[PDB]
Design a protein around this nucleic acid. Sequence first.
RNA 1: UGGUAUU
Lengths: 256, 241, 118, 108, 195
Amino acid sequence: NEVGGEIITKVADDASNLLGPNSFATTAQPENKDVVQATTTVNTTNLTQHPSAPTIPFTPDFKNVDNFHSMAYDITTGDKNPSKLIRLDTASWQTSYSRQYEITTVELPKSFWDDTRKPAYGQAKYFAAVRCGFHFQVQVNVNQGTAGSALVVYEPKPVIDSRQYLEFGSLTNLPHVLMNLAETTQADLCIPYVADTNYVKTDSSDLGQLRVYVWTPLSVPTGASNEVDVTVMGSLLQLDFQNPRPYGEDVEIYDN
Amino acid sequence: LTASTKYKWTRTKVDIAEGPGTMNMANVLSTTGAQSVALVGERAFYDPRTAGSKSRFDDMIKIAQLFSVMSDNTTPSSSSGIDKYGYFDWAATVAPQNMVHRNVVTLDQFPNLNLFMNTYSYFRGSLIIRLSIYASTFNRGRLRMGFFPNCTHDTQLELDNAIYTICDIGSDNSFELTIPYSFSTWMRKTHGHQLGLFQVEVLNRLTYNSSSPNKVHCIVQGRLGDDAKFFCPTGSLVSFQ
Amino acid sequence: VQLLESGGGLVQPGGSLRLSCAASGFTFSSYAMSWVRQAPGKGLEWVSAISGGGDSRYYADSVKGRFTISRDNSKNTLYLQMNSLGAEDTALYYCAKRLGRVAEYYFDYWGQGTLVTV
Amino acid sequence: IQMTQSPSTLSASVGDRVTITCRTSQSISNWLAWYQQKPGKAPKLLIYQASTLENGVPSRFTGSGSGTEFSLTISSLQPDDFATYYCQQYNNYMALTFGGGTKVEIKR
Amino acid sequence: SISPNELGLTSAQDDGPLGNEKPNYFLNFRTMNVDIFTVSHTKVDNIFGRAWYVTSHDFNNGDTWRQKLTFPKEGHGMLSQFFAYFTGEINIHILYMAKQGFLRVAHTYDTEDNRKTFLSSNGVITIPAGEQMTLSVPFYSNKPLRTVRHDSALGFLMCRPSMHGTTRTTVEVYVSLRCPNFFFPVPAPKPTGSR
RNA sequence: UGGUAUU
């Protein structure tokens, strides 16, 4: 009864003298009301049917930003750290390599987080599916007085499969950078997500590869360098891991 | 007076033209009208962003307008460039007015245009030959690539009357030579008479010092112009793998 | 449910016998049947399967274009017209029945087999 | 395609946990099945759909795995679990195939 | 004004985004562009609107014929080999040559070869004996893009004849694509032989 | 409605 208290009070105010009521009463719903709480975070619901009141410290400040900037980087660092410029591969280019020799080959999704040293390795273990756009910088440095060029081609997954049946002369139908080493020492090449499915598996080469072929052999003079390194740096323009999985599990997200 | 009480109403009678149930599958307007086996006759929403594009490729002539190496090889020409391979080398021992390359340019030497000579019967359009000389920064030479259109006389000819370009190696190392559409009809065959006689003569030999190569590599690669057209689809002459 | 094949024997190379497999104890026409063979002391190669209506026949590559699995739902008998036999067709031929509620082929009940010697 | 089993002969005592593995070339999405065949008798279906148990099959048998790595496990051998075990598969192509067999025999 | 780059002095490394080209000028000539037909024959819709022979098959019995369709490497169809992906409707043209019977054509992109057991639910077109029919197949594929190089790029074709006796009947298939969406250019394939 | 094809 919610009127139970207010009948005792009325009775006591009808019996009151000059010293006021001798009794008082109030009825109300308990301070341990029957309610259900539900909390959700990312991929997580927590249905509690007997919650307690949640507590917080004395006058708390839940802004987590440091006002003195003891780590003076943007707070977005650590969420944008799995997409920084990393060294994907490195090879050597002998002066005896012919005119269609394949120098490097970088398995595109998996080579961004294939090893612990790559800072996107940690995030890549918890997701099975990815969709991402790359930025490559292939760097080849030679001294002045050495000729030869290279072809930096982005071959997508269908081209990897059928590469043996293709003409090398029309290999520049793909997003390429034909780089004369006497001039440039770096070929930039932005590649978007190119696949036949919306997402690829993380641990796969299913966004093709980024090969580096010899366009014309090194024409070195006597008493000059013979080997020339070819480094491939990559950076993800956008990264979008999606399917949660057990740590480093091989989860197939394709239909056979 | 009388209306449809004058004549007995009958449904319309039409005559049927020659060859009913003949399948014309040579005309695009005959095949776009085909009955659908779709459940409601509906169409799908396509996704071009999965292929990393904002739109579909809508004209094949844009692939004819991409450079492709004229007869690729894995080793430079050993005939002194007097062969079809558009990957010759220019030594410094080649004296002026000596060819470093010379071949009668056919349309099937370029791998991109090898598929349009096996798909289309006729074509018209200019040919852009590009000659990229891969020399170092200390080399200094001068080539003169000329083109005699519709000339199949494969011997050393003076290029003074040709459609030539004088190439000076420096920091821009790719020299385009536009050859206009030249033929006696409005569209020539793609597998007929050869396009002409391309030749690359040395004009001023290739100089070098102790810190630079005495022999640089060249890559000839061509495409068709922005006025290129291919007409009349026809059968292939070779299959592809 | 009990399948009983019959028709095994001895034939000369390039022969042509036809195994039968009278079936009882179940509604025959609502299940696919197969003929899986077992060459002496080894494996279990699957020769061919026929769907319940008989409107789809599948053959293994080894016996394809030679054998012809048929069925005659009326008299509950599955056939295996084998032509141009080799010495690789010397096996015990079991007549398996397809499993119940599943969208895949798994062999439920099996016969006792009929030897074929070539 | 062809799937190869891992042991071709297992020898174990009555009460041991034996594991026969079957490994396919390309993924089949749980579409495997295990057979027991006593010598001179016709095969008996044990485990269909990679882990489901056919009726009247002991609970010793327990198949697992999906994709390209299936395994039949007998928790404790009994004297009637000495037989040959084949793994038939189903795939899209309808190219049903069986394993090589895995003879499980007495360890004397 | 005309710069020296428009007289043909370029660097191949200074080619920016792919498929960006400019014409060069000589004193006495420049690009012409002459139309000698009222429509283009290199427009993508137009060129693949014409059909091309795929396969022929003799039906000596009533069994369903599953044929995986793919882009050809001969004919005029092979210009699709310049692309990696494809989305679109495809027309199938079937010439059923029989004395009696009907041919039940159906198309699916489903790789499971056990969904043709009850063929009716894939959408059947019955072609009378001795007739031919063009059916337009919609893009009912799980993948949003078909790989051109795949052997079953254009899905599968199921034809089950309503045989009269065991009298054989033949069927020639020709494919063509109505409004194809082709993406991402790839290298030209090399002619047969070569190596 | 001879709206006696439909309306």
